[PDB]
Amino acid sequence: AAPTLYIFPHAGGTAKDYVAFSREFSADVKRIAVQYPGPLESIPTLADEIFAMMKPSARIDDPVAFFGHSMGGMLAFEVALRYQSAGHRVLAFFVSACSAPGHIRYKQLQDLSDREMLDLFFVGALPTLRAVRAIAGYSCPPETKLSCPIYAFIGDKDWIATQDDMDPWRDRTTEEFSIRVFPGDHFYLNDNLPELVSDIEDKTLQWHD
Numbered sequence: 001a002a003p004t005l006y007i008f009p010h011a012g013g014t015a016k017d018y019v020a021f022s023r024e025f026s027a028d029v030k031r032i033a034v035q036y037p038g039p040l041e042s043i044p045t046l047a048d049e050i051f052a053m054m055k056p057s058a059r060i061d062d063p064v065a066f067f068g069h070s071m072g073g074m075l076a077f078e079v080a081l082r083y084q085s086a087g088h089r090v091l092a093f094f095v096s097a098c099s100a101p102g103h104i105r106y107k108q109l110q111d112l113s114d115r116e117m118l119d120l121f122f123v124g125a126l127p128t129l130r131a132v133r134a135i136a137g138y139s140c141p142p143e144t145k146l147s148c149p150i151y152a153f154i155g156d157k158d159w160i161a162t163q164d165d166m167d168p169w170r171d172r173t174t175e176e177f178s179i180r181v182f183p184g185d186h187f188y189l190n191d192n193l194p195e196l197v198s199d200i201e202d203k204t205l206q207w208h209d
């Protein structure tokens with residue numbers, strides 16, 4: 001009777017990084033921050049794992065919504081697709097600082113995890129390098145779409161993800177699409193937390209009943 005929002009963190013991001021984000025929401029929305037298990041993994045296989053653990057947390061009748069920042073955007077989209085095919089009620093999908101899924105698969109994911117030689121044109125760089133491998137191996141067919149509205153959010157000074165690469169998220173939905181630009185870089189949300197959350201909450205409760 002109260003919608004539940006699933007929070008998908010960025011590559012290297014934990015559920016603890018999204019405590020401040022979740023705190024900004026009122027009691028009208030339930031928040032479940034996903035914690036990732038962590039040259040063997042892809043976005044769809046990780047989404048299959050997340051979906052298996054996540055499905056029992058909400059009843060088939062329960063209204064659910066998804067939020068993803070950066071890599072979390074690709075995973076949240078993939079888990080939302082699985083929820084829809086399973087017959088769940090997906091209200092909306094909120095994608096932040098994440099490019100729209102590409103249609104081709106790049107064979108640059110067969111490089112060794114010691115990409116230090118190729119990167120030099122250390123342990124702290126491993127999570128970012130593993131994400132590049134998962135992103136270059138991630139593709140989605142043009143026909144694969146959600147039947148719920150998509151809300152895109154981007155930072156004006158983000159070079160990793162721009163309005164141009166976030167715009168094709170409109171083709172990943174059968175319904176409404178909206179894109180909002182906030183001042184900031186790849187982690188713009190830290191400085192725009194009240195306005196971003198009030199926007200997500202308003203839209204989640206709007207589609208809820």
Ligand SMILES: [Ca+2]
Nearest residue numbers: 020024193194
């Ligand atoms: Ca805050």
